[PDB]
Structure 1
């Protein structure tokens, strides 16, 4: 081009450029004040415009990595603030850039960000919308140094639309708060997946990643040819590798190439790539990334023809094992947008074991003659779990359905921490209200994506402070066997009851003045604690104690002497409840 900055600036826009540079610097210099980044931004935008004007102006020829490294190395307190990172400045590119990557702290000290009052928030927004949004863009980016910037920028825009709209509403809090919470989760969800869709690539290798990729792509581009899906799966694997390595530029560039590629051969790949492909440079891929499944051909053959009716099956499989197996996934995946990707992998794996254990036996056609029957029970397990858990979710509500999971898992692994159980059981419940509202055709996929993060979250906590070998069994198992492993946990007969504690079961009228999502957690904490005390309690006995409590809480929060009623009836409840169990 002659000048990268000039070109990036030109096809990015001043607004987005200023935003991305800010995020970029906040991801490395996680400890410099906000006003310090604002200075650098202006400084780099000034330079950028200098190059837009004259392509041959000072340094405009330098590459973006070099320019970026110099501005980084000009920070005076670099060595005093980051120390070892300052040594990176002594080496030259590419060694210098590789050195900054290695010193990018994944999770720093930084205090938890707190949400101020809607009023001060809206007033700050109104008074000076820009430093209000940029300041927080800064707060988020320094705490999540691996979050793809363009992505973090999409969230910024959404946060903007929530303030513009709600700070102008009658009841601001009632408008903004729900939108903010919804953004937090979606944000944390997006982050978790990115960390997950790196760790996986680290542990299980390229092969397993590609497998996951073929299934996922053919499920969405069912009309594309297998050769096209292979091409995409390849480029797609290169993208994640780089993006995971942390180099933003390389990552962003590879993602752009891919998106332009898909859009040119658009006709050859999905038909639903319409709007996405006419959108600006910055959103194209993020759009392609969420595009819905194209419709499937409907004029499609049967799999058993090419994969079971032995017309030279082993002769085709030995000729190129992975390609053939890849072809299996493609065919099976695109006929089933309703299966979770892992289920597709379990089938593909099951098929693989058969071909291996069959093709080395006299007459093959009859050894693997009935594989599709091998599949049947693999497909049903997840399906039965869905509708079974979804019907329970309708009978009870999100909350009561939450208490049910609570009793179910506290019994599975009583060893686990009470606060951890409450949180995991809550997320699980949400996945229920977030997916059970879809038609059976899109439930399994939904559950899979939500369940994959909740399960990894659960697994990471257990990493730190281990508690059960069973959880560790599942957590270190194969990604394709992780959820089935958890589903296979049974009551812990071995478990020895926690000693009764008066304290843990005492309640003051303060619960009457606590928020909805606070009363619940305090009751749900008492529930876990109750089950850990009486692990042999029946669903009947437990419901009796829970009905007595539900009433007791009102009988006292609806009375004039709150805290007498809580200490008097309280002794009774505990006394009676203790006798009803044992």
Structure 2
């Protein structure tokens, strides 16, 4: 009867309020903390009133009508979010559709900063205000963050301030932890953003196909029907979360977790760990569970998929089932492949049956289908080996620099802070993946590459600048990474006009923390590439080498700024001659 009561009953007040703050922050990314809170309280109050009397006036309205309505009463809508007030003219579902277009993927809000001093004070003060504020901060910053996962991370962020506010050194305990937690927030956010981008750009069928491959890898002992079932449920969960229906999403998620834990023996023996846990933790653990060992009765695939004479007839009768089965079987035995490579492999299998089934003697044509996969596998494997050899040899910073040079040549129209952010995120993929056991390297690098490329595509929908990037971002999810790998120097780019100020440094760079000093160097690297796109990577590396020596030198000078002023213009002119 009352959907609001229903969710309030299912989730409990703590989690309901939490999720509703997340939904509100992400949707209305600008408001102070306390105005989101007042709206959360109003909605929560209304929920309690409905739970006690479901036939109460307004109680039977959809969540969307309810929350859309709330959102549209906020102070100063046409001044904070001028395009957003227009949304308020529309009914549901159009209203919510309108609201979602408006979500902003790069609000570039102040950087989140651990002040172990002032924060610890506020936490001892009112721990509930403190968590709320954290949820609020994250959500507005990552408007698509997996709702129920944010509540998990809030518990973590809380358990940190616990262990570290009593401690002798406040930042001592706390800065590494909050540093770690940031990374996991960014990774988590990038995983979910890929899911919502897949429903947005490619649809539900692509999301299901991705999840079939990935879940078959993780639960290779489960049967097909059990994988389908979980993929069906999981897909609905993320479809809801990506649509801002965080309450339904959380509720369906807990139902999923409970289903998976009641059937753990026919799913995976890695789950027992997860299933012995509390709610949020249990779900988190299932979502991140490692791949089970392979069963020793995995069937030989040739028989059903290459040799059987009725293949074309099972294909023509039931394409989606037949291809799903192939996907499930091939993926469960290839935890050493990336999800996208599995999907590419499934699409080549499909394409081969389309072709062979329309010639005189199909079995003779499709007999070799598994043999056509060999080049598909070898291209990403050797790409991963080349990038990990380079990483191992030059280390992270130079590996970022090499990727910055590579991506700026592919897309020199992209703004400098995006090129640096992506080259840096892709170099951290090396550090994360290159050190793993070698059979883990390929899925690690390729899966994480999908995340960084999709961040590039999300930004590019906001601010399109390149037709080649559009085409890679929108043609096919599974082909993205090879479509990017194949871009080269955009050959009718016109070198960006030289601007001496861009390459001019001052003493301020001397007080920067290490990574901010690197970002300043790596931005001038990408600018060197924009002005001399034909320069070889070996020339750029030399000139950047000269810029760093010049910075180290001037930051050690008695008079930092005279050194910058005296030496800079020489270096800036002679660099251009070196990049010819």
Q: Same fold (TM over 0.5)?
A: yes
Q: Give 1:112's aligned residue.
A: 109
- Tell me the distance in 2 between the aligned counterparts of 1:567 and 1:89: 55
Between 1:245-254 and 1:392-401, the stretch displaced more is 245-254
Partner Cα separation in structure 1 for residue 209 and residue 402 of structure 2: 36
1:121 corresponding residue in structure 2: 119
Q: Partner of 1:227 in structure 2?
A: 225
- Any idea what SS the aligned residue of 2:271 has? coil
Matched, 1:78 2:76: no
2:247 to 249, 257, 260: 249
1:361 matched residue in structure 2? 359
Go from structure 1 to structure 2 and tell me whether the alpha carbon gap of 1:224 and 1:546 turns closer, same or farther (over 3 Å shift): same
Q: Distance in 1 between matches of 2:534 and 2:173?
A: 45
Distance 1:44 1:414, change over 3 A: closer
- 2:274 alignment partner, one of 276, 279, 283: 276
**Counterpart for residue 430 of structure 1:** 428
Question: Cα distance, 1:483 vs. partner?
Answer: 0.7
Pairwise CA distance, 1:27: 5.9
Q: 1:97-126 CA deviation, whole Å, 9 max, x = no partner? A: 986676566349988255463322222223
Inter-partner Cα distance in structure 2 for 1:351 and 1:74: 49
Q: Give the counterpart of 1:470 among 457, 465, 468.
A: 468
SS in 2 for 1:414: coil
Distance 2:89 2:402 in 1: 59
Please say if 1:390 is aligned against 2:388.
yes
Task: Return the offset for 1:378.
Answer: 0.2
Determine the C-alpha separation between the residues in 2 that align with 1:482 and 1:219.
Answer: 21
If the length of structure 1 is used for normalisation, what is the TM-score?
0.85
**1:189 corresponds to which residue?**
187
SS in 2 for 1:362: coil
* Aligned counterpart, 2:158: 160
TM-score w.r.t. length of structure 2? 0.86
Distance 1:99 1:464 in 2: 20
Any idea what SS the aligned residue of 1:408 has? helix
- 8 Å CA contact retained: 1:27, 1:142: yes
Mapping for residues 481-520 of structure 1, pairs under 5 Å: 481-520=479-518
Quick one: which of 370, 377, 380 aligns to 2:378?
380
Q: Given that residues 65 and 97 in structure 1 are in contact (C-alpha distance below 8 angstroms), is that contact kept between their aligned partners in structure 2? A: no
Cα distance in 1, alignment partners of residues 138 and 173 from structure 2: 23
Alpha-carbon distance in 2 for matches of 1:527, 1:211: 39
Cα deviation 1:463-508 (Å, max 9, x = unaligned)? 3333332222212210111110110112344444334333233223
Q: 1:350 to 1:96 in 2, by over 3 A?
A: closer
The higher radius of gyration belongs to 1
Give me the whole-angstrom Cα distance separating, in 2, the residues matched to 1:231 and 1:80. Answer: 45
Residues 136 and 101 of structure 1, relative CA distance in 2, 3 Å threshold: farther
- Distance, in Å, in 1 between the alignment partners of 2:196 and 2:541 is 43
**Does the C-alpha gap of structure 1 residues 233 and 135 become closer, same or farther in structure 2, counting only changes over 3 Å?**
closer
Which stretch shifts more, 336-345 or 418-427? 418-427
Following superposition, the deviation at residue 17 of structure 1 comes to: 4.9
For 1:5 and 1:77, the matched residues in 2 are separated by 18
Q: 1:256 to 1:102 in 2, by over 3 A?
A: farther
In structure 1, distance between residues paired with 2:288 and 2:59: 29
Structure 1 unaligned spans of 5+: none
Deviation of 1:20 after TM superposition, in Å, equals 4.1
Of residues 244, 251, 256, the one that matches 1:258 is 256
Check 1:410–1:517 CA distance in 2 against 1; reply closer, same or farther (3 A cut).
Answer: same
Query: 1:515-536 CA deviation, whole Å, 9 max, x = no partner?
Result: 2122212211222222333333
Contact 1:259 1:288 in 2 (8 A): yes
> Residue in 2 aligned with 1:151?
149
Q: CA shift at 1:340, angstroms?
A: 0.8
Contact kept, 8 Å, 2:3 with 2:61, in 1: the verdict is no
Q: Once the 2 structures are TM-superposed, how far is the Cα of residue 239 of structure 1 from its aligned partner?
A: 3.1
CA-CA distance at 1:229 after TM superposition: 2.0
Please tell me whether the aligned partners of residues 12 and 281 of structure 1 are also in contact (alpha carbons under 8 angstroms).
Answer: no
Cα RMSD (Å) of the superposition?
Answer: 3.8
Note the alpha carbon deviations across 1:15-37, whole angstroms, 9 max, x for none.
Answer: 44554455456567777765566
Taking a change above 3 Å as real, the CA distance of residues 72 and 399 of structure 1, as seen in their structure-2 partners, is closer
Q: Distance in 2 between matches of 1:581 and 1:5?
A: 64
CA–CA distance in 2 between the matches of 1:578 and 1:90? Answer: 56
Is the 8 Å Cα contact of residues 106 and 459 (structure 2) preserved in structure 1? no
| Count of residues paired in the alignment | 574
Q: Could you tell me whether the CA contact under 8 Å between 1:310 and 1:364 is conserved in 2? A: no
Counterparts of 2:389 and 2:505 in 1: how far apart (Å)?
A: 33
Once residues 474 and 76 of structure 1 are traced to their aligned partners in structure 2, the CA distance between those partners, rounded to angstroms, is 36
- Comparing 216-225 and 365-374, the one that deviates more: 365-374
* Counterpart pick for 2:214 among 213, 216, 219: 216
CA distance in 2, matches of 1:101, 1:581: 49
Instruction: Pick the aligned partner of 1:328 from 312, 326, 332.
Output: 326
Post-superposition Cα deviations, 1:176-227, rounded to whole Å, max 9, x if no partner, equal: 3343343334324333433431332243233333222221121111111122
CA shift, 1:386, in A, is 0.9
Q: Once the 2 structures are TM-superposed, how far is the Cα of residue 160 of structure 1 from its aligned partner?
A: 1.1
Closer, same or farther in 2 for the Cα pair 1:325/1:172, shift >3 Å?
Answer: same
Who is 2:175 aligned against?
177
Q: Separation in 1 of the partners of 2:45 and 2:536?
A: 71
Note the C-alpha offset of 1:314. Answer: 2.0
Change (3 A) 1:506 1:246: closer
